[PDB]
Amino acid sequence: EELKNAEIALRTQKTPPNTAPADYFHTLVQQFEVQLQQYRQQIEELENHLATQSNTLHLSPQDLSMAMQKLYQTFVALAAQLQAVNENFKMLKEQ
Amino acid sequence: LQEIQQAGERLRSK
């Protein structure tokens, strides 16, 4: 990334020898806009996993069963998605 | 486990 930046920089330099900086600043705004929420989500998840590890002392075996049933449902609807993509691409290669 | 933490988060959010 740095190398491509420097190459284009050299080109622009050989061309030279305020709107752009304000636009770059606003882009720097946009970049972090979502990242603040990424931090907030990861923080709420850190609190959640900390609370769960507080229960990680022993607990009752059933939650695994719940996650396994949701896992089979997830893989099933995912097979729906993947089979759908396969069938549509096969219709394309037919066309 | 950050994916496990995310999945526990998805349990918590769903």
TrEMBL record, chain A:
The lineage of its organism: Eukaryota, Metazoa, Chordata, Craniata, Vertebrata. This is MGC84997 protein. It comes from the Eukaryota. Residues 29-56 form a coiled coil. It is found in: Nucleus, Nuclear pore complex.
